């Protein structure tokens, strides 16, 4: 599930890096963190394996 979240984050970073230039760019400014923690939250929030 973290690999799925990382694939989503990679898609987001690929969609966002085309707009923001890489030369003189603020570090880690295009990498998102919502789908990273959202995947583990769903895994521990309402997953069938983490049900109880």
């Amino acid at each position: 599930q973290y690999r799925v979240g990382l694939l989503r984050m990679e898609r987001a970073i690929k969609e966002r890096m085309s707009s923001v230039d890489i030369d003189t760019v603020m570090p880690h400014d295009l990498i998102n963190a919502k789908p990273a923690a959202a995947a583990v939250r769903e895994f521990f929030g309402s997953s069938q394996l983490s049900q109880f």
């Binding site: 880690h28 400014d29 963190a33 919502k34 069938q48 049900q51 109880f52």
Partner: protein
């Protein structure tokens, strides 16, 4: 090969059918400009459009809307804000003052031509020459005036309505005359050269036996009704034999412009398809997002000139992004959150993400109010705004049984116990009121209403019994203090809780 999918079907039409217009954007823009030029040329002619635009412009300039409603301010100084507004206003006023006489002469010539066509005599003693001379001046004045599209829209609508009425009349005449051996395409050719004489159906029986039968007892009344409708519509708007070709050419120009716009849209829809991939899972389906961004794409072609950077790619992507963000902010939360509130919550979440990325742990909601330079109480109400209403059919256990909808309580359903106290409070009140005076009990009940739900005030219940004064309030206070003893108010002491 049944796909059974709207998304796939939409993609197939765009791909297997539509071809990406490469380096043809500028050509489509030039075609749209040519269509607009054709529409303007058809509009500025001898008809009701030139008279309506001239008569409407006569009141403008001094006491009516002179700029921003008749002629575009940008189009005036485009070939040449406060200085440009007054400069174009004086020029438009001078043009109207110089073209008023030309418009009057053109209207007189049109009236004379309509009279000659309705009577039968052909006005050839320089009448047509004077009419053309008066119309050319008005056309040249309107073309160089660089008017706006506001009145142009109403003129095109009126022209389309008149053309639809004329087409309906012609179709009715063709259906009435083509019973035996007549056709529909010959009606226009007959009415173009046999419209001056009133007995058009009678003086057109040169050859053919079916024509006589269609004119006698077949369409003799239909042709008269059509001629009467045409004569009534000539005075209401533009005359006949001159507005027909004008509306035809303006409709052709509008059709060409619409075809160019549709071609540019279909040759760019792939763009919208490509842009609708980053907004997926934001409250709208993929095909829904595509067909919503199509609205913004069509709105972009309406304003697309030959400015710097003629590539329509950037403009199209900006407009699709604005249309998706304008629609995703509305049909995504199930509550129709406003667009500005959606952008505010997006700014708040972006600030929170940047703080988590750079500063560290999650900041307090009170800190986000000052981090964005906004009111502290406004940020407290921005969050907790029902971000996503959970589905009422979601599962509650390990299986898909007993969803959340079956466990939600009801805060409005009157419980049977609370109805029990209602019925008994209706019984316990009728018993306590049975000990009071009959008229006094009646007026007290009218003060609130046991059987009648119309709760009357003090004076309203006063008029029903005696003179509306403090006597009713006095008797009400006496009654209220009456049933306060342990004998009368015994079963009610445990009723108020």
């Amino acid at each position: 090969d049944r796909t059974d999918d709207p998304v796939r079907m939409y993609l197939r039409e765009m791909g297997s059918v539509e071809l990406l217009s490469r380096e043809g954007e500028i050509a489509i823009a030039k075609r749209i400009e040519a269509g607009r030029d054709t529409m303007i040329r058809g509009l500025c002619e001898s008809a009701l459009t030139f008279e309506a635009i001239m008569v409407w412009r006569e009141e403008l300039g001094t006491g009516r809307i002179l700029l921003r409603e008749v002629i575009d301010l940008e189009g005036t100084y485009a070939a040449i804000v406060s200085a440009m507004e007054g400069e174009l206003r004086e020029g438009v006023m001078a043009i109207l003052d110089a073209i008023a006489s030309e418009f009057e002469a053109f209207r007189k010539l049109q009236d004379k031509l309509v009279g000659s066509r309705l009577k039968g005599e052909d006005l050839s003693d320089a009448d047509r020459k004077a009419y053309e001379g008066l119309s050319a001046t008005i056309i040249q004045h309107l073309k160089t005036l660089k008017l706006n599209n506001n009145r142009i829209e109403a003129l095109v609508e009126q022209l389309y309505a008149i053309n639809k009425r004329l087409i309906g009349l012609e179709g009715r005449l063709l259906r009435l005359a083509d019973s035996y051996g007549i056709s529909r395409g010959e009606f226009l050719k007959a009415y173009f050269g046999s419209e001056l004489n009133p007995t058009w159906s009678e003086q057109v029986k040169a050859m053919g036996v079916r024509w006589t039968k269609f004119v006698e007892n077949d369409s003799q009344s239909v042709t008269d009704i059509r001629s009467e409708i045409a004569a009534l519509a000539t005075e209401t708007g533009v005359p006949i034999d001159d507005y027909r070709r004008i509306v035809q050419t303006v409709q052709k120009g509008e059709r060409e412009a619409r075809q160019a716009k549709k071609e540019m849209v279909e040759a760019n829809l792939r763009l919208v398809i490509s842009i609708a991939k980053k907004y997926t899972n934001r409250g709208l389906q993929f095909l829904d997002l595509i067909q919503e961004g199509n609205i913004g794409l069509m709105k972009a072609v309406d304003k697309f000139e030959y400015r710097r950077g003629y590539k329509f790619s950037t403009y199209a992507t900006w407009w699709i992004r604005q249309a998706i963000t304008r629609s995703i902010a509305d049909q995504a939360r199930t509550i129709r959150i406003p667009v500005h509130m959606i952008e505010t919550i997006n700014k708040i979440v972006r600030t929170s993400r940047q703080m988590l990325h750079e500063i560290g742990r999650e900041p307090t909601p009170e800190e986000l109010a000052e981090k964005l330079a906004m009111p502290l109480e406004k940020v407290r109400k921005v969050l907790k705004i029902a971000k996503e209403p959970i589905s009422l059919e979601t599962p509650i256990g390990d299986e898909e049984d007993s969803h959340l909808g079956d466990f939600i309580e009801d805060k409005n359903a009157i419980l049977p116990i609370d109805a029990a106290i209602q019925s008994n409070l209706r019984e316990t009140t009728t018993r306590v009121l049975a000990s009071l005076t009959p008229r006094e009990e009646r007026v007290l009940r009218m003060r609130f209403g046991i059987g009648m739900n119309t709760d009357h005030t003090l004076e309203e219940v006063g008029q029903q019994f005696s003179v509306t004064r403090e006597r009713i309030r006095q008797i009400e206070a006496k009654a209220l203090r009456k049933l306060k003893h342990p004998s009368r108010s015994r079963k009610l002491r445990s009723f108020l809780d």
